[PDB]
């Protein structure tokens, strides 16, 4: 899910939401995707 | 209701096929595709 | 820029796979269209191409006969080796300008391979009969 | 670089069956040239032409034919541009789809709009060939439907095409593709010359030849069907799909002309490039909104 | 022309059966039939007959019940039997199973017609 | 020209022929690229080899849809004694894969499902049973070996 | 960038091992499919390939016969040496264009090795009989 | 068996096995108006891109 | 056809045993049997027999108890004995142990049938 751009709030805190809005939910910025795409591209070109 | 497809070729008549197409008109959920509204927004 | 090209090579790889499959789907569609009484195919195909359909195996996928649409480094390398080999044959008087032109306008590795093998056989046979003719001429002169 | 060629995967691999089919083809060509050649005037010309086909092989002839077809149609249709458009579709949606069909007797290839294809009954498969049922709904011009269905449209249907009010003046063309089921028979017969068991597949109407050791079984097997509806009153080409994409050993392997892929990760929905650049674009738009309001003040 | 043909998607696909219609009876046609081809050169045929693999199925001849029960024919004539055996292949002329089934059915009906013709010839000469 | 060949040569040619054809046919490198992505996400890369429709086929297994039991701290998946594969297949796929063994009752079951996606739950069990076999000691008749 | 490639070469090494094992598993699956009455294998295989199954050793792993799927520097170096050796044979009139084309389209190191050894034998034998023929011609002229 | 396409005015040759069907088929037409009173070249387009 | 065959996963795998069924008795079949092959050219066989490695196991012949005890047969006839000996190999035609066991069992049953046939021939000529 993290690679597919989905963040679970229950995976980084206790949830004391289910509404898809930032004033209580958190943005995900997929900064990990490029790193893995580099390695898969090199795998393809080997 | 989509008609029955366990028939012999003889019983697959004209009205059977017309029923198939009418069902197709009566009508989207997929497991590995986004909604049409999502794709429309992207385009 | 290469290291950045790695980031998008996955998009390009899945695209290339989709293209290969779409060309196979087009090839089977064209095969089925062959047996539909269309005179266009008589113009873009050879005689043997238009007689292949008369055999009883033409209803099935070409991948089941060992024929696959392929755009990989193997195919490009094979094309380069065949072209360079034909050039090396052109010098040494082993391959004709006509058959060179046929190789340049073949589109099939099998066709140009067969053309090269052909010309090897005819030049070898003409050389051998030339030696035989000269030898028998000398022998009958001595006789 | 775009050079997609049909190649023989194992070109040094020739078998007896390939040789038999080659011999059949050469015999057929011999008969044709005897039929056409008028008493030795050009018979030797035909022999000179077909002598160099003796060193060919069955796989070579098939590969030449396939390359000829693909070469001509790639150059004719500008297929690479179609693929470029589909690649753009894939980067926007993560979905790239193409349809192969016969229209006017020639094979044609078209890029499917991802918003105008409804794919049903797939198994978390990223390939579009694996669907059991696909519906294509699009608006065609009257000229296109008459170009595509002249030989099956009834006079009543063409009057329907005339009598529409035409307040664009296009027609809703809904095309259904669905894998039906057919009953086929797996008959086991012995080769008469040698005591070798043989297998064959026949339709349900086949009568098993008793008194010869033929025993039969009944299987239910996929068949690809199609049907088209134009407007709301026209019903055209309701039949088994005449292009059954068949395989040698499996009678149930068939699909439709539609081929494509989902650019997804592990049986999920595709997280496209536009998806992963969109939040940044929205933040850019908001911040530039603040910038413009600052510029105004 | 719809007789043994599937003219769809701008092509002309056939299952091999030749529905030789619109000509007329041998006596009613001034040319004694349609004269499909030259090979006996006068290969004449009437409206009711069908041809598969250069073999003519006769419409005037009837099906004996003895030959009905064995080989499992359906039509009242041999031409009608051939027309009923090839119904499955008309809508799918490209399908390998349909082609094999059609070939088997046509061989069966051909053998049945040869048996009937031998029986009639023997009875007439008797 | 096959006289100068050897048994190992003929076997190697056959194996290379099979792998060459099927690598070019299936685009196996793309399957391996997907599995490599799976490995970098999970640390788990799995592939299944099976016969379907008489031909050999190779598929990438979803790491979330394979239950591997009875292994011995082994990082290899071949070492498991029992594996369960649970996935949702289309009716077309199950009929493509089991036409020659599905009974008419089973195909009626496939029809009669309500179909409110219309996929079928296909659970495949693989397990190492045990068989009793005999180790028989015999003498070569010609030589006392 | 090489020193950074070292950081991920372990992922790549385990990936390559998994690929080798998956290709061996596919090879055994294909071997078992051979004896299943499928006519596809008659098209992608030679005659000898389709007769190997008739021997009673085909039920077991190929690794038990000395055959292993291998993508290592040894295999690539062997392929390069064989290709370069074939090129060096092409000049000096020791190897035919036809057999060169066969080497370019072989996929097996054993096959192309045997092809080179073949052509060495036939050119050597034809040369030797040529010398013998010339010598006996001179001898009978003198006689 | 042979196939051909003919216009509607063609008379099917009975007594030779010729059976016929009627299809409606696109034809490209053109027409020009100059000013408001002139009407020129109202006919099937002589360049039928067939 | 399920007779000595394992048709699964889209293939046709056999253990070598040929369950020659659906033909009929020699007298009931118009062609005197199924006529599997040509080699004596008329190699005729009936419905009850099975064949392994071109060796026919006869269903009409019975198993003497003397030949039952030694070689350890199970079926009442030789065909039934062969059908019972190959049950283990049907579901695993590829297994080397099953192939070896089937070969051994088929050789044993063949030798038993030859012994029975010699005994019957000697008794009849007696
Ligand atoms: Mg041309
Ligand atoms: Mg081959």
Swiss-Prot record, chain B:
Localization per Swiss-Prot or TrEMBL: Virion
Subunit and interaction comment: Homododecamer. Interacts with the Cargo protein 1. Interacts with the major capsid protein.
Protein's job: Forms the portal vertex of the capsid. Probably involved in head assembly, genome packaging, tail attachment, and genome ejection.
Protein name: Portal protein
Organism, scientific name: Bacteroides phage crAss001
Full protein stretch here: 6 to 51 of 806
From Swiss-Prot, chains C, G:
Cellular compartment(s): Virion
Domain of life: Viruses
Function: Forms the portal vertex of the capsid. Probably involved in head assembly, genome packaging, tail attachment, and genome ejection.
Subunit note: Homododecamer. Interacts with the Cargo protein 1. Interacts with the major capsid protein.
Official protein name in the record: Portal protein
From Swiss-Prot, chains E, I:
Chain segments carrying region Interaction with the portal protein: 1-126
Subcellular location: Virion; Host membrane
Organism superkingdom: Viruses
Reported function: Protein that is stored in high quantity in the viral capsid and may play a role during ejection.
Assembly: Homododecamer. Interacts with the portal protein.
Full protein name: Cargo protein 1
Shown part of the complete sequence: 425 to 552 of 842
């Amino acid at each position: 899910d993290l690679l597919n751009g989905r963040l679970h709030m229950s995976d980084l805190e206790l949830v004391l939401i289910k509404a898809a809005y930032i004033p209580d939910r958190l943005q995900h910025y997929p900064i990990m995707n490029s790193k893995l795409n580099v390695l898969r591209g090199e795998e393809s070109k080997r | 209701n989509f008609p029955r497809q366990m028939l012999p070729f003889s019983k697959k008549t004209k009205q059977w096929r017309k029923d198939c197409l009418l069902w197709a008109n009566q009508k989207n959920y997929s497991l590995v595709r986004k909604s049409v509204i999502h794709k429309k927004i992207n385009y | 820029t290469l290291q950045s090209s790695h980031i998008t090579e996955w998009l390009f790889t899945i695209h290339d796979d989709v293209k290969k499959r779409a060309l196979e789907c087009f090839l089977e569609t064209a095969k089925v269209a062959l047996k539909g009484r269309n005179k266009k195919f008589q113009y873009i195909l050879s005689d043997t191409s238009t007689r292949v359909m008369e055999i009883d195996g033409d209803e099935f996928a070409e991948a089941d006969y060992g024929l696959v649409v392929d755009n990989s480094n193997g195919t490009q390398e094979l094309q380069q080796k065949l072209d360079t080999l034909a050039q090396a044959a052109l010098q040494t008087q082993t391959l004709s300008f006509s058959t060179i032109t046929k190789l340049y306008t073949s589109s099939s590795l099998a066709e140009k391979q067969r053309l090269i093998e052909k010309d090897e056989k005819q030049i070898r046979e003409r050389q051998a009969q030339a030696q035989k003719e000269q030898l028998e001429a000398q022998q009958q002169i001595a006789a | 670089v775009f050079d997609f060629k049909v190649v023989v995967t194992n070109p040094n691999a020739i078998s007896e069956i390939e040789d038999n089919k080659k011999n059949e083809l050469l015999q057929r060509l011999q008969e044709m040239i005897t039929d056409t050649s008028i008493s030795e005037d050009e018979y030797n010309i035909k022999l000179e032409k077909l002598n160099d086909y003796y060193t060919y092989e069955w796989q070579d002839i098939r590969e030449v034919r396939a390359n000829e077809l693909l070469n001509h149609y790639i150059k004719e249709y500008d297929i690479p541009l179609i693929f470029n458009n589909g690649f753009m579709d894939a980067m926007t949606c993560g979905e790239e789809i193409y349809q192969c069909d016969i229209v006017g007797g020639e094979p044609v290839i078209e890029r499917v709009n991802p918003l105008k294809i409804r794919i049903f009954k797939s198994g978390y498969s990223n390939k579009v060939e694996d669907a059991d049922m696909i519906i294509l709904e699009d608006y065609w011009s009257p000229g296109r439907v008459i170009d595509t269905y002249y030989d099956v449209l009834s006079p009543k249907d063409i009057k329907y095409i005339e009598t529409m009010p035409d307040y664009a003046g296009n027609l809703r063309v809904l095309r259904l593709y669905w894998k039906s089921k057919r009953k086929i028979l797996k008959v086991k017969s012995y080769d008469p010359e040698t005591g070798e068991e043989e297998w064959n597949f026949y339709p349900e109407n086949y009568v098993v030849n008793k008194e010869a050791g033929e025993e039969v079984q009944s299987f239910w097997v996929n068949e690809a069907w199609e049907g088209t509806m134009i407007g709301n009153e026209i019903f055209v080409n309701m039949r088994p799909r005449l292009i059954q994409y068949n395989r040698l050993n499996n009678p149930s392997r068939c699909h439709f002309g539609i081929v494509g892929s989902i650019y997804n990760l592990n049986d999920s929905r595709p997280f496209s490039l536009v998806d992963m650049m969109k939040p940044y674009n929205y933040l850019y738009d908001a911040i530039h909104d603040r910038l413009n309001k600052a510029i105004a003040s | 022309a719809f007789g043994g043909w599937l003219n769809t998607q701008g092509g002309d696909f056939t299952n091999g059966v030749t529905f030789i219609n619109e000509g007329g009876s041998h006596e009613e046609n001034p040319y004694q039939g349609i004269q499909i081809g030259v090979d006996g050169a006068p290969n004449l045929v009437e409206q009711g007959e069908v041809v598969y693999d250069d073999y003519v199925f006769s419409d005037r001849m009837e099906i004996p019940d003895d030959i009905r029960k064995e080989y499992k024919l359906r039509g009242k004539t041999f031409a009608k039997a051939a027309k009923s055996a090839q119904r499955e292949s008309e809508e799918r002329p490209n399908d390998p199973l349909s082609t094999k089934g059609l070939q088997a059915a046509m061989e069966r009906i051909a053998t049945a017609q040869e048996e009937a013709r031998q029986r009639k010839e023997a009875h007439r000469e008797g």
